[PDB]
C-alpha cells in the first residue's frame, strides 16, 4: 500500500495497537503494508526512530489539552493536561511504553515552549516548573503503564488464590479491581498539584 | 549449571541486566545456563511468570527500606521507602519495566500488609492510604523508566541539533542533562508527600 511517512506511521500505529512493541518487527510491518522488507527499509530503518515517531503521532491525534486556556490557572492547566495526556497514552497498546525516555520533537517545540513559558509566567522558575511538569508526566506514565500491564497479564495468567491473603491487602486488591485506575490517578494528581502549590507559595519561607 | 529456582532466577536476572526483557528468550536463557531448551522448559515455562519472579527478586535483593522504623512518621516512611524502591529498580536494566503491572507475591504479603496497616494507623483510611502508596509507586516507576529509557536511546541515536530549539526548552534540556534524574525525583517526591498530608489533615474540611 502507500508508503508516505503518514501511511507508514499509520500502519505502525495500527500494528503497535495490535501486538505491541514486541510485535512491531520488520517482517510484521512489511506484512501489514503488503511489501517486502527491503522496500520497508527504504522508508524506515531504525526501530527507535519509528517508536519516537509513534510517540509524537499518538499525542498529535489524541492529546487534546496541550495548551492553557486564556486566564487558566497553572493548577487547572496541569490537571487538564494530565488527564488529556493519560487519555492519549491509554488509547493504544504500549502507548505509554513508546513514550518513555523520548524528548520533545521539533513538531512539538512551539507547544512545549509555551507550556514552559506559561509555568514561568505563573511564578515558577524554569527549573521548578520543569520539576512540576516532570513529576506530573512521570506519575501519569507510571499510572498508565501499571494499569495497562496489569490488564495484559490477566491474559498470560490468573492472579492467585483469595485464600492466603492478609485482610488489608485483600481489600486493597478489591479496591483496585473495582476501577480501571482513574479514581486513584485523579486523587494522586490533586495531591501532586497541591504540593507544587505549597512549594511555590512558600517562596523563601521554611515549609 | 545448577537449575534450582534460586539459580534459574539468578541467571535470568543476570541476563535481564545484560540485554533486557527482549533478550530474555528461551534460547538465550538456555545458553547462559549451558543447557538445552527442553531442559529449561522443565524449570520455567512462562515468560510472565519469570518476569514476575524477577520483579520479586530485585526487591528482595536491593529494596532495603521496606518497613517503617519504630515511631517513624508516615511521611518519612514514604520518603525512605520511595528512595529505596527507586534505587532497587535502577539496579538492573529493565528493572522498573519488569515491575510494571505486577501484584504482590505471597513472599511479600507480610511486608505489604504491614505497610498498609501502618498507613491506616496514621489516620488514612485503607483507600486513601492505598491512593498515596499507588501514587508514590507510580511516580517512582515513571521517573525510573524515563531515566533508564532516555539513557538507552542515546546508544540507538544522537538526540538532535542544538540550533532550532526554542530557549526555555534548550535550558530545560540542559537542566535535565546535568543530573541523572535524582534531583527532580526528590523534589517531586516532597510535593507528592505534602499533598497527601494536606489531604489527610483536612478531614471533612473543604480544601
Ligand atoms: C504531559 N505534559 C506535562 C506535557 C505535554 O502535555 C506534552 C505535549 N506534547 O503536549 C509533552 O510533550 C510532555 O508530555 C512531555 O513528554 C515533556 C517532556 O518529555 C519533556 C522532556 O523530556 C524534556 C524537556 C521538556 C519536556 C516537555 C516540556 O516537553 C514535557 C511536557 O511538558 C509534557
Ligand atoms: C514502593 N512502596 C510504596 C511499596 C513497597 O515498598 C513494596 C515492597 N515490596 O516493599 C511493594 O511491593 C510496592 O512497591 C508495590 O509494588 C505495591 C503494589 O504493587 C501493590 C499493588 O499493586 C496492589 C495492592 C497493594 C500493593 C502494595 C501495598 O504491595 C504496594 C506497596 O506498598 C509498594
Ligand atoms: Cl508509496
Ligand atoms: Cl485514531
Ligand atoms: Cl482556572
Ligand atoms: Cl539442577
Ligand atoms: Cl545483586
Ligand atoms: Cl519521622
Ligand atoms: Mg516526554
Ligand atoms: Mg507494584
UniProtKB/Swiss-Prot annotation, chains A, B:
Query: Which parts of the sequence belong to the HTH tetR-type domain?
Result: 2-62
The residues that hold Mg(2+) are 99
Locate the residues binding tetracycline.
63, 81
Q: Which domain of life is it from?
A: Bacteria
The record's section on PROSITE patterns has: HTH_TETR_1 (PS01081), HTH_TETR_2 (PS50977)
Q: Which UniProt keywords apply?
A: Antibiotic resistance, DNA-binding, Magnesium, Metal-binding, Plasmid, Repressor, Transcription, Transcription regulation
Q: Which Pfam families match?
A: TetR_C_1, TetR_N
Kindly indicate whether the keyword Lipoprotein belongs to this entry. Answer: no
Q: Name one GO molecular function term.
A: DNA-binding transcription factor activity
DNA-binding annotation, residue ranges on this chain: 25-44
Induction statement: By the [Mg-tetracycline]+ complex.
Q: How does it assemble?
A: Homodimer.
Function description: TetR is the repressor of the tetracycline resistance element; its N-terminal region forms a helix-turn-helix structure and binds DNA. Binding of tetracycline to TetR reduces the repressor affinity for the tetracycline resistance gene (tetA) promoter operator sites.
| Name of protein | Tetracycline repressor protein class D
Amino acid at each position: 500500500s502507500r508508503l508516505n511517512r503518514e501511511s507508514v506511521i499509520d500502519a505502525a500505529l495500527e500494528l503497535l495497537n495490535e501486538t505491541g512493541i514486541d510485535g512491531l518487527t520488520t517482517r510484521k510491518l512489511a506484512q501489514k503494508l503488503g511489501i517486502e522488507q527491503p522496500t520497508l527499509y527504504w522508508h524506515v530503518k531504525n526501530k527507535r526512530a519509528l517508536l519516537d515517531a509513534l510517540a509524537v503521532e499518538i499525542l498529535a491525534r489524541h492529546h487534546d489539552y496541550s495548551l492553557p486556556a486564556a486566564g487558566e490557572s497553572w493548577q487547572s492547566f496541569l490537571r487538564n493536561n494530565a488527564m488529556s495526556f493519560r487519555r492519549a497514552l491509554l488509547r493504544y497498546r504500549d502507548g505509554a511504553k513508546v513514550h518513555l525516555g523520548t524528548r520533545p520533537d521539533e513538531k512539538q517545540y512551539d507547544t512545549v515552549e509555551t507550556q514552559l513559558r506559561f509555568m514561568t509566567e505563573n511564578g515558577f522558575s524554569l527549573r521548578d516548573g520543569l520539576y512540576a511538569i516532570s513529576a506530573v508526566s512521570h506519575f501519569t506514565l507510571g499510572a498508565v503503564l501499571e494499569q495497562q500491564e496489569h490488564t495484559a497479564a490477566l491474559t498470560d495468567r490468573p492472579a492467585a488464590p483469595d485464600e492466603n491473603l492478609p485482610p488489608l491487602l485483600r481489600e486493597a486488591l478489591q479496591i483496585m479491581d473495582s476501577d480501571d485506575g482513574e479514581q486513584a490517578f485523579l486523587h494522586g494528581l490533586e495531591s501532586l498539584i497541591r504540593g507544587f502549590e505549597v512549594q511555590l507559595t512558600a517562596l523563601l519561607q521554611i515549609v
